[PDB]
Amino acid sequence: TGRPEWIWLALGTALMGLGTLYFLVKGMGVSDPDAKKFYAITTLVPAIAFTMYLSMLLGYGLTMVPFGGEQNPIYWARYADWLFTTPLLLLDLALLVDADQGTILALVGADGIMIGTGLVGALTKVYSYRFVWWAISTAAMLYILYVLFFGFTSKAESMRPEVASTFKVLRNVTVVLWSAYPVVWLIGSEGAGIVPLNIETLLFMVLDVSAKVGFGLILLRSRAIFG
Amino acid sequence: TGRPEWIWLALGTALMGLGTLYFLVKGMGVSDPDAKKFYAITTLVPAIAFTMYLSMLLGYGLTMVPFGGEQNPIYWARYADWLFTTPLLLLDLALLVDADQGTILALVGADGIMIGTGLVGALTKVYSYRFVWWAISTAAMLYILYVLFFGFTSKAESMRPEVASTFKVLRNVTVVLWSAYPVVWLIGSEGAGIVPLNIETLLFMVLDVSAKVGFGLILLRSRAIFG
Amino acid sequence: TGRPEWIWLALGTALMGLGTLYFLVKGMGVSDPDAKKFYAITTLVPAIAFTMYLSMLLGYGLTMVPFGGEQNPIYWARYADWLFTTPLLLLDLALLVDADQGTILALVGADGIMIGTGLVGALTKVYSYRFVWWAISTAAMLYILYVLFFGFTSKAESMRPEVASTFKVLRNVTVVLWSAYPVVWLIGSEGAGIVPLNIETLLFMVLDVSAKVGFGLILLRSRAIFG
Ligand SMILES: CC(C)CCC[C@@H](C)CCC[C@@H](C)CCC[C@@H](C)CCOC[C@@H](CO[C@@H]1O[C@H](CO)[C@@H](O)[C@H](O)[C@H]1O[C@H]1O[C@H](CO[C@@H]2O[C@H](CO)[C@H](O)[C@H](O)[C@H]2O)[C@@H](O)[C@H](O)[C@@H]1O)OCC[C@H](C)CCC[C@H](C)CCC[C@H](C)CCCC(C)C
Ligand SMILES: CC(C)CCC[C@@H](C)CCC[C@@H](C)CCC[C@@H](C)CCOC[C@@H](CO[C@@H]1O[C@H](CO)[C@@H](O)[C@H](O)[C@H]1O[C@H]1O[C@H](CO[C@@H]2O[C@H](CO)[C@H](O)[C@H](O)[C@H]2O)[C@@H](O)[C@H](O)[C@@H]1O)OCC[C@H](C)CCC[C@H](C)CCC[C@H](C)CCCC(C)C
Ligand SMILES: CC(C)CCC[C@@H](C)CCC[C@@H](C)CCC[C@@H](C)CCOC[C@@H](CO[C@@H]1O[C@H](CO)[C@@H](O)[C@H](O)[C@H]1O[C@H]1O[C@H](CO[C@@H]2O[C@H](CO)[C@H](O)[C@H](O)[C@H]2O)[C@@H](O)[C@H](O)[C@@H]1O)OCC[C@H](C)CCC[C@H](C)CCC[C@H](C)CCCC(C)C
Ligand SMILES: CC(C)CCC[C@@H](C)CCC[C@@H](C)CCC[C@@H](C)CCOC[C@@H](COP(=O)([O-])OC[C@H](O)COP(=O)([O-])O)OCC[C@H](C)CCC[C@H](C)CCC[C@H](C)CCCC(C)C
Ligand SMILES: CC(C)CCC[C@@H](C)CCC[C@@H](C)CCC[C@@H](C)CCOC[C@@H](COP(=O)([O-])OC[C@H](O)COP(=O)([O-])O)OCC[C@H](C)CCC[C@H](C)CCC[C@H](C)CCCC(C)C
Ligand SMILES: CC(C)CCC[C@@H](C)CCC[C@@H](C)CCC[C@@H](C)CCOC[C@@H](COP(=O)([O-])OC[C@H](O)COP(=O)([O-])O)OCC[C@H](C)CCC[C@H](C)CCC[C@H](C)CCCC(C)C
Ligand SMILES: *C/C=C(C)/C=C/C=C(C)/C=C/C1=C(C)CCCC1(C)C
Ligand SMILES: *C/C=C(C)/C=C/C=C(C)/C=C/C1=C(C)CCCC1(C)C
Ligand SMILES: *C/C=C(C)/C=C/C=C(C)/C=C/C1=C(C)CCCC1(C)C
């Protein structure tokens, strides 16, 4: 159920909150329209994460789902978060590399399917089916990481060194971090309950904060965001 | 509960409906692609408002939420409306002033959070928490009004007199009207039930019709929408 | 109820699935950014259709709605599908014809209302009201078909013969196919239950597969998608 993980939810709420304030209080005197975009995108990521983490701490983002033969605690707020949040992160990567509109649309589409499909899995009552959705969701993710690693890097090679190197760091951080989510999900309370909801919430928190605040920090503190 | 406010819901449905028909039957012979955008955006605002007002009149947009120690009548359709509707209005303002993509994204993002956060508050069962969400939602709104008043006006000063003056009127109308919503919400059935759902529905109706049909009228009947 | 139509749901799932794989394994070596857009848009249509068809086969996309004086089986997954799917198809048509942003926004808006309004109708408990929503939804559709037939054709006349002719075929296929949906809905389980859910699911399947895979095939196998 949901009570002992309250501390990781409170800390996540706090970290996303402070992360938003910091990015806000840093893009204030920015005149460059390109940099402006990066700050707007990057600042909204933790801001959204803040509201959803708060809904989980306060209990609104938690529901109960029966499967296997029990009532399981499912924090559905994560999907609401990730639905807008993961595409924004992808958008940062795309602008940095100047991706084609077509690929940006393919990426956002793949991402929406990944999260939507992951949400359906989390709320499915037939235990066995949850894993089918997990598989579809993971296939979507793999497609996204493939394009960022192989497709985007190539695109980054045509920009100036500052941009190419910052993209490289951001690229490595998201590929590694993003692939941990399906694993956490599979072994957590949403799948084979090997790991307790307590530790699971701590894992997602570290992952979320790293994939947003950290990512944001690496990006917003480089000159890559400038023309 | 919901029954005696049926008249304000029926009138709102009617006014949004006639408002859509009028804007539609006015943008028919418009060749200017810029003006076309304004008509498309502005016409969809009342059209959406029409469908949601109708759902409330017919009872579908009403739900019951327990909090304090009672079953409260919450018209959730408003948020569904405002979720697409408020950003469209912001988009009209942005095109008129030729805002940067970055700021447009920040505004739409702030707006989505404002409505989403306001929806969560309206459906929260812990009476005390509803106000936390209200606070977050209001902070988001204040951020939006700040940019429209101080940021956009500056941008409008670089356009021709017709555009600058129409923007000024639209700006004053939305800043004043938008700030009334959180007050109505706070004192209405969603917050401290000082005002009866009856009078509350009448307030939102006047506010909604003014902020859409009125706004649309001020905009679509000026030459500001032309290049 | 839902059980005997499982075969049409399984076949639809299969066809959308194979349809996605085929389009994916065809746009692989495409360098043209314009063609790229078409492949991205067109491939995502069946991909989304796949996930929603699967949710219906597995039972998640089915709910029960009381109206008339009974518990009716309503596959709500269709709307989730169509909400993103119909606009994407419209986007293909718009790019092919190089439509104005204003009209694209009017079309997407009309489309969202059509599906949203159709969803509300499908879930409404007052039998009589369901048809009011159906009427509003159909009016929205008629507005869309009008613009595609009369507005877009004109726009297509200014492109080269390959584009104009492919647009013509796509135009005829969507106008005819799209208008069948409201009829199926009206006579199916969502409206006057003249046709059994069994036959209804078979009708939507043929319509869906034709309006996506077929449409995609006609488009992706022509040179129209190139500059
Ligand atoms: C403009 C865009 C293009 C915007 C579009 C936004 C929208 C489409 C996003 C949807 C996102 C999806 C992914 C999340 C939905 C998940 C869905 C499956 C879960 C839905 O459930 C929650 C929903 C409704 O809450 C409820 O109200 C109903 C009506 O009154 C009730 O009938 C429900 O029961 C009620 O559910 C709540 O309460 C349940 C309680 O049960 C009880 O448990 C307690 C425990 O102590 C006790 O046991 C009781 O006895 C028992 O009864 C609980 O179980 C439920 O979980 C739930 O709390 O909520 C709506 C949420 C809203 C949509 C969140 C918004 C998210 C944020 C703010 C979005 C910011 C987005 C902007 C748009 C991004 C901008 C950037 C872009 C430009 C890129
Ligand atoms: C393409 C885009 C990018 C589009 C995305 C669109 C989508 C994400 C928008 C979401 C918007 C959000 C903000 C609204 C959701 C609020 C949410 C919390 C509330 C959800 O509840 C309603 C929902 C489901 O209805 C229900 O069906 C279920 C399944 O069958 C049932 O299990 C539920 O119970 C049922 O709920 C209804 O009935 C309840 C009844 O209870 C009873 O009360 C009676 C009273 O007499 C009596 O007491 C009975 O005994 C008792 O049981 C009732 O309480 C509930 O409130 C409810 O009526 O509804 C889905 C709504 C749908 C999403 C509305 C669409 C809005 C319009 C048409 C959108 C137009 C948008 C276009 C996209 C804009 C284009 C412009 C852009 C380009 C900028
Ligand atoms: C980024 C974007 C801009 C993205 C936005 C996405 C979002 C807003 C889309 C919303 C789309 C709308 C149109 C669909 C919503 C319809 C809505 C009215 C119906 C909602 O109900 C389902 C919902 C929740 O499921 C449930 O969880 C709750 C919490 O735990 C429970 O309280 C509910 O009860 C539960 O409902 C399920 O179970 C019910 C079971 O009852 C039982 O029946 C069995 C039968 O054997 C038995 O009798 C039992 O005893 C009895 O109790 C069942 O009746 C219900 O129907 C339901 O199964 O589900 C959330 C779905 C999720 C949103 C689907 C996502 C769709 C796909 C993957 C989208 C891909 C999109 C990308 C974004 C497109 C990209 C392209 C663009 C760029 C153009
Ligand atoms: C604990 C918290 C996490 C909880 C908070 C609740 C929160 C969920 C609600 C708040 C909404 C929030 C999510 C909104 C996100 C905004 C974010 C995306 C913004 C990123 O930033 C994008 C920029 C766009 O810039 P511009 O306006 O276009 O400026 C043009 C300039 O004039 C040069 O033009 P030139 O090129 O021609 O030379 O935002 C506009 C730049 C402006 C010019 C400057 C604006 C300054 C701000 C108003 C002040 C900064 C905030 C404060 C330090 C405190 C924040 C409090 C909070 C409650 C709002
Ligand atoms: C009671 C009611 C509230 C209930 C109604 C239900 C409602 C919810 C469903 C309807 C959907 C509705 C919401 C859709 C909104 C549409 C709105 C946003 C449109 C705004 O308008 C945008 C324009 C885009 O213009 P274009 O097509 O691109 O024209 C280009 C021209 O050829 C010049 O080109 P050049 O530059 O090269 O010289 O719409 C296209 C312009 C067209 C060329 C002209 C179209 C005319 C219309 C078809 C007729 C107008 C409507 C009728 C008077 C009656 C309406 C009935 C209703 C049921 C539809
Ligand atoms: C049974 C199934 C239905 C179930 C599947 C589950 C599914 C729901 C989840 C998968 C997500 C899926 C929906 C995603 C849709 C993607 C689709 C929209 C893509 C359409 O395609 C758009 C392109 C964008 O192209 P680019 O990257 O920008 O290439 C630029 C080039 O370098 C030239 O540049 P120049 O102009 O300068 O010269 O996608 C990128 C092009 C790449 C360069 C090439 C990519 C190749 C692919 C990685 C391999 C193709 C797929 C495989 C055959 C098998 C698919 C398995 C599935 C599980 C993913
Ligand atoms: C700020 C949040 C971030 C960066 C979240 C990333 C999330 C993912 C990559 C989630 C992926 C999932 C799967 C591949 C399968 C199972 C379910 C999910 C949704 C956890
Ligand atoms: C057509 C509708 C319009 C212009 C609606 C505007 C709505 C707002 C500015 C709503 C703001 C709210 C808050 C700031 C806090 C509490 C809840 C809301 C959603 C009523
Ligand atoms: C891939 C799916 C396609 C092309 C779906 C098209 C759907 C429509 C044109 C649906 C229209 C409807 C109405 C006009 C009224 C009643 C309800 C609907 C949603 C079935």
Side-chain angles (χ1 to χ4, degrees), chain C residues 1 7 32 34 59 61 63 67 77 95 105 107 149 194 218:
Chain C
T1 183
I7 187 176
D32 184 53
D34 286 60
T63 194
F67 63 73
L95 298 196
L105 180 64
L107 276 284
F149 199 78
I194 314 162
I218 296 176

Side-chain angles (χ1 to χ4, degrees), chain A residues 16 45 49 79 81-82 85-86 89 114-115 117-119 133-142 145 177-186 204 207-209 211-212:
Chain A
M16 293 301 183
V45 167
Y79 310 90
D81 176 328
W82 306 339
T85 253
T86 50
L89 259 13
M114 181 186 77
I115 302 305
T117 259
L119 173 55
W133 293 114
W134 173 90
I136 298 169
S137 180
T138 302
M141 183 199 82
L142 285 173
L145 308 183
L177 292 181
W178 284 40
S179 46
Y181 287 76
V183 178
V184 170
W185 194 102
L186 188 75
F204 278 136
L207 251 30
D208 286 351
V209 179
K212 294 173 161 77

